[PDB]
Design a protein around this ligand. Structure first.
Ligand SMILES: O=C(O)CCc1nc2cc3nc(CCC(=O)O)sc3cc2s1
Ligand SMILES: [Zn+2]
Ligand SMILES: [Zn+2]
Ligand SMILES: [Zn+2]
Length: 101
């Protein structure tokens, strides 16, 4: 049951020119596992169970919201919750198309 809104949705940006690549590896360690994409700047970094690079990215940029390339959920690091909202539908849909074909 994600939150239906959070105060950080305002920081969600339009996706890169080239679209999304759900097989893009972590920009720091290159892992192919458990990556997330940043919904502000669209850099890709790994989850807390691999090397924690997305949490590091959150700390060093302040960017709030990230989308999972495993299950297309969106986490806000400030609110410490999952969020779903209209503002996230396009990025979720584009990711889902790229993932499942
Ligand atoms: O496990 C606990 O201590 C209880 C509360 C939780 N912390 C989480 C952190 C978390 N970070 C996410 C973004 C991706 C990443 O950096 O791994 S999704 C996600 C889900 C949970 S549930
Ligand atoms: Zn990494
Ligand atoms: Zn970012
Ligand atoms: Zn938030």
């Amino acid at each position: 049951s994600p939150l239906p809104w959070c105060p950080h949705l305002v920081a969600v940006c339009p996706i890169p020119a080239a679209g999304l690549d759900v097989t893009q590896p972590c920009g720091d360690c290159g892992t192919i596992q458990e990556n997330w994409v940043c919904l502000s700047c669209y850099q890709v970094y790994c989850g807390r169970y691999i090397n924690g690079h997305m949490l590091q990215h959150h700390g060093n940029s302040g960017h709030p919201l990230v989308l999972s390339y495993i299950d297309l959920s969106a986490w806000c690091y400030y609110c410490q919750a999952y969020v779903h909202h209209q503002a996230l539908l396009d990025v979720k849909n584009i990711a889902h198309q790229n993932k499942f074909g």
